[PDB]
Design a protein around this motif. Structure first.
Motif, mmCIF file in Angstrom:
data_model
loop_
_atom_site.group_PDB
_atom_site.id
_atom_site.type_symbol
_atom_site.label_atom_id
_atom_site.label_comp_id
_atom_site.label_asym_id
_atom_site.label_seq_id
_atom_site.Cartn_x
_atom_site.Cartn_y
_atom_site.Cartn_z
ATOM 1 N N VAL A 1 0.833 -1.185 0.000
ATOM 2 C CA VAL A 1 0.000 0.000 0.000
ATOM 3 C C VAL A 1 0.875 1.245 0.000
ATOM 4 O O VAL A 1 1.966 1.239 0.567
ATOM 5 C CB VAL A 1 -0.913 -0.021 1.222
ATOM 6 N N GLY A 2 0.396 2.316 -0.637
ATOM 7 C CA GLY A 2 1.139 3.558 -0.703
ATOM 8 C C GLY A 2 0.263 4.668 -1.267
ATOM 9 O O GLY A 2 -0.773 4.398 -1.871
ATOM 10 N N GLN A 3 0.683 5.920 -1.070
ATOM 11 C CA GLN A 3 -0.064 7.062 -1.557
ATOM 12 C C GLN A 3 0.645 7.667 -2.760
ATOM 13 O O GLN A 3 1.734 8.222 -2.628
ATOM 14 C CB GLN A 3 -0.205 8.090 -0.439
ATOM 15 N N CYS A 4 0.025 7.560 -3.937
ATOM 16 C CA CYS A 4 0.597 8.096 -5.156
ATOM 17 C C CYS A 4 -0.263 9.243 -5.667
ATOM 18 O O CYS A 4 -1.481 9.228 -5.506
ATOM 19 C CB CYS A 4 0.696 6.987 -6.201
ATOM 20 N N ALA A 5 0.375 10.241 -6.284
ATOM 21 C CA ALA A 5 -0.332 11.390 -6.812
ATOM 22 C C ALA A 5 -0.032 11.542 -8.297
ATOM 23 O O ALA A 5 1.129 11.546 -8.700
ATOM 24 C CB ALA A 5 0.086 12.641 -6.044
ATOM 25 N N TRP A 6 -1.083 11.667 -9.111
ATOM 26 C CA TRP A 6 -0.921 11.819 -10.543
ATOM 27 C C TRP A 6 -0.231 13.140 -10.849
ATOM 28 O O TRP A 6 -0.731 14.203 -10.489
ATOM 29 C CB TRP A 6 -2.289 11.755 -11.218
ATOM 30 N N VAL A 7 0.923 13.072 -11.516
ATOM 31 C CA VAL A 7 1.677 14.258 -11.867
ATOM 32 C C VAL A 7 1.440 14.604 -13.330
ATOM 33 O O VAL A 7 1.245 15.769 -13.671
ATOM 34 C CB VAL A 7 3.160 14.016 -11.602
ATOM 35 N N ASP A 8 1.457 13.588 -14.196
ATOM 36 C CA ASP A 8 1.245 13.791 -15.616
ATOM 37 C C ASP A 8 0.365 12.678 -16.168
ATOM 38 O O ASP A 8 -0.039 11.780 -15.432
ATOM 39 C CB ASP A 8 2.592 13.820 -16.331
ATOM 40 N N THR A 9 0.066 12.739 -17.468
ATOM 41 C CA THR A 9 -0.763 11.736 -18.106
ATOM 42 C C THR A 9 -0.086 10.375 -18.025
ATOM 43 O O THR A 9 0.954 10.158 -18.643
ATOM 44 C CB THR A 9 -1.010 12.131 -19.559
ATOM 45 N N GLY A 10 -0.679 9.456 -17.260
ATOM 46 C CA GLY A 10 -0.129 8.124 -17.105
ATOM 47 C C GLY A 10 1.138 8.171 -16.262
ATOM 48 O O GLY A 10 1.833 7.167 -16.124
ATOM 49 N N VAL A 11 1.436 9.343 -15.696
ATOM 50 C CA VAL A 11 2.614 9.517 -14.870
ATOM 51 C C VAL A 11 2.207 10.003 -13.487
ATOM 52 O O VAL A 11 1.782 11.145 -13.328
ATOM 53 C CB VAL A 11 3.559 10.513 -15.537
ATOM 54 N N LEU A 12 2.336 9.131 -12.484
ATOM 55 C CA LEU A 12 1.982 9.475 -11.121
ATOM 56 C C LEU A 12 3.168 9.224 -10.201
ATOM 57 O O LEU A 12 3.846 8.206 -10.321
ATOM 58 C CB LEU A 12 0.775 8.648 -10.686
ATOM 59 N N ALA A 13 3.416 10.157 -9.278
ATOM 60 C CA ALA A 13 4.517 10.034 -8.345
ATOM 61 C C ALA A 13 4.067 9.256 -7.117
ATOM 62 O O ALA A 13 2.877 9.213 -6.809
ATOM 63 C CB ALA A 13 5.009 11.424 -7.953
ATOM 64 N N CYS A 14 5.021 8.641 -6.414
ATOM 65 C CA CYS A 14 4.719 7.869 -5.226
ATOM 66 C C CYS A 14 5.483 8.434 -4.037
ATOM 67 O O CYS A 14 6.559 9.003 -4.203
ATOM 68 C CB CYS A 14 5.090 6.407 -5.463
ATOM 69 N N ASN A 15 4.924 8.275 -2.835
ATOM 70 C CA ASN A 15 5.555 8.769 -1.629
ATOM 71 C C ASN A 15 5.846 7.612 -0.684
ATOM 72 O O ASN A 15 4.926 7.006 -0.138
ATOM 73 C CB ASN A 15 4.643 9.795 -0.962
ATOM 74 N N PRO A 16 7.131 7.307 -0.490
ATOM 75 C CA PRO A 16 7.595 6.242 0.374
ATOM 76 C C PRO A 16 7.397 6.643 1.829
ATOM 77 O O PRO A 16 7.715 5.875 2.735
ATOM 78 C CB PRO A 16 9.079 6.090 0.045
ATOM 79 N N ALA A 17 6.871 7.850 2.052
ATOM 80 C CA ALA A 17 6.637 8.345 3.393
ATOM 81 C C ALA A 17 5.268 7.889 3.880
ATOM 82 O O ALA A 17 4.967 7.980 5.067
ATOM 83 C CB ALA A 17 6.731 9.868 3.395
ATOM 84 N N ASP A 18 4.438 7.398 2.957
ATOM 85 C CA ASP A 18 3.107 6.932 3.295
ATOM 86 C C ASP A 18 2.880 5.549 2.704
ATOM 87 O O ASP A 18 1.746 5.175 2.416
ATOM 88 C CB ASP A 18 2.074 7.924 2.768
ATOM 89 N N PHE A 19 3.963 4.790 2.522
ATOM 90 C CA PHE A 19 3.872 3.454 1.966
ATOM 91 C C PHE A 19 3.851 2.427 3.089
ATOM 92 O O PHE A 19 4.822 2.295 3.831
ATOM 93 C CB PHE A 19 5.056 3.211 1.034
ATOM 94 N N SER A 20 2.738 1.699 3.214
ATOM 95 C CA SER A 20 2.598 0.689 4.243
ATOM 96 C C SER A 20 2.626 -0.697 3.615
ATOM 97 O O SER A 20 2.795 -0.829 2.404
ATOM 98 C CB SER A 20 1.292 0.914 4.999
ATOM 99 N N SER A 21 2.460 -1.731 4.442
ATOM 100 C CA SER A 21 2.466 -3.100 3.963
ATOM 101 C C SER A 21 1.525 -3.946 4.808
ATOM 102 O O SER A 21 1.273 -3.629 5.969
ATOM 103 C CB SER A 21 3.888 -3.652 4.019
ATOM 104 N N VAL A 22 1.004 -5.027 4.223
ATOM 105 C CA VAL A 22 0.097 -5.914 4.922
ATOM 106 C C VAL A 22 -0.065 -7.208 4.138
ATOM 107 O O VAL A 22 0.261 -7.264 2.954
ATOM 108 C CB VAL A 22 -1.250 -5.220 5.105
ATOM 109 N N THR A 23 -0.573 -8.250 4.800
ATOM 110 C CA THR A 23 -0.776 -9.534 4.158
ATOM 111 C C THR A 23 -2.205 -10.007 4.382
ATOM 112 O O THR A 23 -2.744 -9.864 5.476
ATOM 113 C CB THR A 23 0.222 -10.544 4.718
ATOM 114 N N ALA A 24 -2.817 -10.572 3.339
ATOM 115 C CA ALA A 24 -4.178 -11.061 3.425
ATOM 116 C C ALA A 24 -4.195 -12.416 4.120
ATOM 117 O O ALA A 24 -3.293 -13.227 3.924
ATOM 118 C CB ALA A 24 -4.769 -11.166 2.023
ATOM 119 N N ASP A 25 -5.225 -12.658 4.933
ATOM 120 C CA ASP A 25 -5.354 -13.911 5.653
ATOM 121 C C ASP A 25 -5.925 -14.978 4.730
ATOM 122 O O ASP A 25 -6.086 -14.745 3.535
ATOM 123 C CB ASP A 25 -6.253 -13.708 6.869
#
Length: 113
Positions: free
Chosen positions: A34-58
């Motif tokens: 999981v992570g928070q990405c923001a669209w910067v350009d057409t088909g181009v979105l930036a990602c923030n490793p400052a809000d990137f989490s992780s989890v596993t499905a049961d």
């Protein structure tokens, strides 16, 4: 295909806000990024490793994680390029989680306003 995940309302929320993300119908025992990405350009979105989490499905194929909402941050393009400080308060952002293969539940469409 994107599974069914219930996330809290994060549209129009400023920093400090917490967006819930619950997957339903996703690969059971599968990992997700999981992570928070923001669209910067057409088909181009930036990602923030400052809000990137992780989890596993049961075994039920359901997961639960918390996504931190940020007003802005370094738009780290998935490609691994530095797009630039994105302003979630200027565009619509979305959260999500990727695994080893790079799969995840139905993308999380979010925004700021």
């Amino acid at each position: 295909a994107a599974p069914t995940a219930t996330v809290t309302p994060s549209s129009g929320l400023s920093d400090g806000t917490v967006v819930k993300v619950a997957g339903a119908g996703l690969q059971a025992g599968t990992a997700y990024d999981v992570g928070q990405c923001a669209w910067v350009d057409t088909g181009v979105l930036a990602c923030n490793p400052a809000d990137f989490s992780s989890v596993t499905a049961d075994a039920n194929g359901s997961a639960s994680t918390s996504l931190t909402v940020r007003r802005s941050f370094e738009g780290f393009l998935f490609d691994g390029t530095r797009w630039g400080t994105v302003d979630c308060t200027t565009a619509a952002c979305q959260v999500g989680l990727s695994d080893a293969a790079g799969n995840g539940p139905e993308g999380v469409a979010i925004s700021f306003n």
